[PDB]
Amino acid sequence: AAKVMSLLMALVVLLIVAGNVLVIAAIGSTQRLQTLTNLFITSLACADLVVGLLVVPFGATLVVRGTWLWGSFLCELWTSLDVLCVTASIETLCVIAIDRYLAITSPFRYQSLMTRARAKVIICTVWAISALVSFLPIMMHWWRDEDPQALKCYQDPGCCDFVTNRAYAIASSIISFYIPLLIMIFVYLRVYREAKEQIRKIDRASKRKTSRVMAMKEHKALKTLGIIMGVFTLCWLPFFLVNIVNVFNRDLVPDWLFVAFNWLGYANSAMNPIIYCRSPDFRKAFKRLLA
Amino acid sequence: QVQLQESGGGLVQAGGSLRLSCAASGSIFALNIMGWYRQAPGKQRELVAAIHSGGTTNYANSVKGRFTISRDNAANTVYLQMNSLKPEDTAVYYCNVKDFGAIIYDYDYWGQGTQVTVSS
Amino acid sequence: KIIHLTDDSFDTDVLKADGAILVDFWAEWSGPSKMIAPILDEIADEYQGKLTVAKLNIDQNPGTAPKYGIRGIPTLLLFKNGEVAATKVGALSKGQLKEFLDANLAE
Ligand SMILES: CCCCCCCCCC(=O)N(CCO)C[C@@H](O)[C@@H](O)[C@@H](O)[C@@H](O)CO
Ligand SMILES: CCCCCCCCCC(=O)N(CCO)C[C@@H](O)[C@@H](O)[C@@H](O)[C@@H](O)CO
Ligand SMILES: CCCCCCCCCC(=O)N(CCO)C[C@@H](O)[C@@H](O)[C@@H](O)[C@@H](O)CO
Ligand SMILES: CCCCCCCCCC(=O)N(CCO)C[C@@H](O)[C@@H](O)[C@@H](O)[C@@H](O)CO
Ligand SMILES: C[C@H](CCc1ccc(O)cc1)NCCc1ccc(O)c(O)c1
Ligand code: NA
Numbered sequence: 288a289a290k291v292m293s294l295l296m297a298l299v300v301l302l303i304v305a306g307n308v309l310v311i312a313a314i315g316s317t318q319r320l321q322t323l324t325n326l327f328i329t330s331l332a333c334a335d336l337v338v339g340l341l342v343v344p345f346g347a348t349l350v351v352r353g354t355w356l357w358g359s360f361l362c363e364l365w366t367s368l369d370v371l372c373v374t375a376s377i378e379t380l381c382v383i384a385i386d387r388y389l390a391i392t393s394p395f396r397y398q399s400l401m402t403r404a405r406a407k408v409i410i411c412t413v414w415a416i417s418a419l420v421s422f423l424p425i426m427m428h429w430w431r432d433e434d435p436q437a438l439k440c441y442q443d444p445g446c447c448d449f450v451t452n453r454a455y456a457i458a459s460s461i462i463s464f465y466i467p468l469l470i471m472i473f474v475y476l477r478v479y480r481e482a483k484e485q486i487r488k489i490d491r492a493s494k495r496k497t498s499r500v501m502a503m504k505e506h507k508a509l510k511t512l513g514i515i516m517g518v519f520t521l522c523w524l525p526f527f528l529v530n531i532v533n534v535f536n537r538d539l540v541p542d543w544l545f546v547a548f549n550w551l552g553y554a555n556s557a558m559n560p561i562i563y564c565r566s567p568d569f570r571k572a573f574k575r576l577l578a
Numbered sequence: 579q580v581q582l583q584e585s586g587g588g589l590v591q592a593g594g595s596l597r598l599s600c601a602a603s604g605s606i607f608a609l610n611i612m613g614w615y616r617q618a619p620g621k622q623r624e625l626v627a628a629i630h631s632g633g634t635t636n637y638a639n640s641v642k643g644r645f646t647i648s649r650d651n652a653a654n655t656v657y658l659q660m661n662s663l664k665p666e667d668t669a670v671y672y673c674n675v676k677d678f679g680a681i682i683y684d685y686d687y688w689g690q691g692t693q694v695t696v697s698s
Numbered sequence: 699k700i701i702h703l704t705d706d707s708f709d710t711d712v713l714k715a716d717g718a719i720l721v722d723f724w725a726e727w728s729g730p731s732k733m734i735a736p737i738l739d740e741i742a743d744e745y746q747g748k749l750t751v752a753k754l755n756i757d758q759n760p761g762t763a764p765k766y767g768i769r770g771i772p773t774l775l776l777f778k779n780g781e782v783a784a785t786k787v788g789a790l791s792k793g794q795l796k797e798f799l800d801a802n803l804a805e
Contacts, residue, residue, distance in 0.1 A: 288801040324682070383682075391609050391678040395628075395636045478609075478681070485608040485631050492651030504607035504679035511681045566683035 296347040299550075299557060303339030306560035307332045313564070313572035320568055323406055324390070327383045328563055330410045334376040335556035342369045343553050350546070355447035362447035363425060370421035371414075374463040376556060378413045380519060381467035383563065384474045392481050420462050430455045448542075456534045464527040471519070475512055482508070514562060522555035580604030580687050582673045587692035594696075595661040600673030600689060602654035607679030612649055612656035616669035616694075626671065627658060640666070663696045670694075699742035703754040705761045711752060713780040718749040718803060723763055723773040725756045731772040733789040741795065748803055749776075776802055 310332040314320045345365050349355060355362050389397040424430045431441060432452045440446035451459075486499045501509075526548035529540050586598040598614060613628030627647040628636045635647055646659040656673065673689035701711055703721070712719050722738060724731035742751040756763050756771065766775065766782065774786045776799075784802050 288804045290805050387681055390684075391681070392632070393634070394611060394630055395634050481632075482608045489608070489652065494652075497652070502607075503605040504677060508607055508679045508681060515681070563682050565680065567685070568683075 293347075293351060296343070296350070296550075299554060300339050300343050300347070302557035303335060303343065303553070306557055307336040307339065309573060309576060310560050310564050310569075311336065312576055313569060316576070317568070317572045320572055323401060323403060324383070324386055326403065326406050327379060327386055327410065330413065331376060331379040331383065331559055331563065334372050334379060335559055337368070338372045338376070338553060338556045341365070342372055346550075346553070349447060354445040356445075359441075359444045362444070366447070366449065367422040367425040370425065370459065370463070371417045373552065374417035374420055374459075375414055376559070377463055377467045377519075377523065378416065379410075380559075381470045382409055382413060384471045384515075388474045388478055391478060416462065420459050424455055424459075451534070453534045456530055460527050460530050464523055468520070468524075471516065475516060479509075479512065518558050518562065519555060521551075522558065523552045526552045580606065580675070580677075582675065582687055582689035584671070584673050584689045584692040587671060587694045589695050589697065590663060592664055592696050592698050594663055595659070596663065596694060598658040598660065598671060598673075598692065598694075600656050602656075602673075602675055602687070604654075606654050606675060607677050609678040611674075611676040612654070613674045613676075614647065614656070614658045614671055615674055616667075616671045618666075618669040621669075623672070628674075629656060660694075665696050665698050668694060668696050699746060699751065700738065701750060701752040703752050703759070703762075705759045708754070708759075708762050712777055715750070715777075718783075719777040720749050720751050720799070721775045721777060722751070722753045723756050723768050723771050723775075724753060725771055727757070728771050730789040734772050734774075734795075737790075737792050737795060740792065741799070745799060745803075749799065774798075 311329060314325050314329050314332075342365070345357070345361075346369075357365075386401070389401065430451050432438070432450055434450075437450040440448050440450055482505070486505075489499050490497070526545070529545050529548055532540055533545065581603050583601045583603065584598065585600075586596055588596070590596055600612065600614075602612070608631060610631050611628050614626040615623050616626050617623040625636070625638055626641055627638065627645055629647045629649050637645065637647070641660075644660065644662045646661075647656065648659070649656045654675075658671075660667070670691040671694050672691045675687040677685045677687065679685065701719075703711055712721060720738075720741075722734065724735065738751050738753070745751075754762055756768070768787075770787050772787070772789060774795075775782055776784045784798070786798055790798070
């Protein structure tokens, strides 16, 4: 079972690094893939890649050994690197939703409105926010709880538990997850509404001669919307729910579950290439890249 | 299978008018762009005009004030009403459909093309 | 197949014993402690060779149970090399118990 658990960490890292390296490669190497949307996808893949190379491996050891082997500084840094990459990943998912919403519903306004220079600013902003919520508060000790038992883990270099004050766990969870989630729900809901509202106008046109039904394309778009919101929420909702719960009633949820829900979130980083890089141009580039 | 059937092209005297018409038979997502592109001999393909499912439009500068794109409210059919034609407009005109059904990316359909020749 | 423990035999039967020993702390007065009796009998046959089921009557042997801090009953302590690897307190179904044993024996 703990033999199975260690095997399961190995494939997680393998999938994350493989997938995300393959995406960045595809985009960087293929002129056809260097679009505006794929700029945001590139930001996402960078974030998830750093999760697989650094965040998850240092994580995997802390489960196996049951203690932090690299001293208090690298604990602090690894914690900051984790928070940064997760925040950048999820906030970038939120920007991709907005991007595709404009491109699908208001494509002509979008082309003049969203430039490559504007997208860079959006991307730079996302990472600057990730940095300021992770590195700034964690290195400067703002994330620290006053509690004596928490303060025992800060003094022990073998302890690298994630223990925060109230303010930080609320604020970081809102900024990394809840605001992005709300924006993703609102945005992708307007796509559904826009599509349903357009089918309504087609039926008004036909002078009571035809009523539209869901075709192949409408079922597929709705499945896609399902996978987008489903996998993102399944993966990160449990952990971020529990993360706020801990700040109030600390005993209620065990530590083995909390960490296991955080591992589920890292799984999303392996899922993202599969979801957001299915384009026929991506499918060609991937074959071309694998000989 | 999606197919695009082009009609309305041909020979016409300069100063005259044509009305292209592309009827898309197949499964298309409600959100989409139907458009006309053209390729003059020894030139690259260029956008003539395009109309989104919503109703917003986009026209090239050369055809502004002359050409008008509109779509059948019921069927997947898009019309380009070309007036004040000039010999410069002579090209193979292609019908294009951008399907947004995958959300993250757009799938493209192209017509075989229809010839339009304007003599002086 | 089940070993029936005493106070004195506990050191030889469990602490010095080879392999994984699943100890049960039962009592004749506890209805929860009786619900596990037939399911442990089935586990002794089905997990033959993979573990040893041991039982200890907490009434007849009051000395053993305080040493490990047994609050309720039935308590199932899974021993390995004279150390306590895992612990489960309360009555279980067969499917719940197999998940505990099958997870803990695969290391
Ligand atoms: C919780 C994170 C929520 C998601 C991340 C959103 C942050 C990006 C916000 C942003 O950068 N802009 C607001 C766009 O709505 C772009 C504008 O500031 C833009 O106008 C300027 O950058 C220049 O283009 C001016 O010429
Ligand atoms: C438009 C975006 C701003 C949204 C509006 C949020 C308004 C609510 C502000 C707020 O929620 N608090 C204000 C005061 O902090 C937190 C308190 O409701 C409560 O959580 C705290 O009193 C305790 O948790 C401290 O132990
Ligand atoms: C490009 C736009 C840059 C905006 C940069 C500011 C980001 C928003 C402010 C902010 O960083 N936080 C919310 C402010 O509370 C998160 C934490 O900084 C803060 O919550 C913690 O420092 C406290 O919880 C510690 O007790
Ligand atoms: C042809 C059939 C195509 C599939 C039909 C859509 C699948 C269902 C989509 C769906 O509604 N969700 C994903 C489940 O698949 C749930 C989310 O919409 C959202 O409600 C949750 O993420 C909330 O927890 C947010 O707080
Ligand atoms: C640093 C910490 C490590 C948790 C952990 C502990 C042990 C492991 O084996 C693996 C992971 N992860 C925090 C994830 C997080 C990311 C962003 C946030 O805003 C937030 O509040 C929390
Ligand atoms: Na520490």
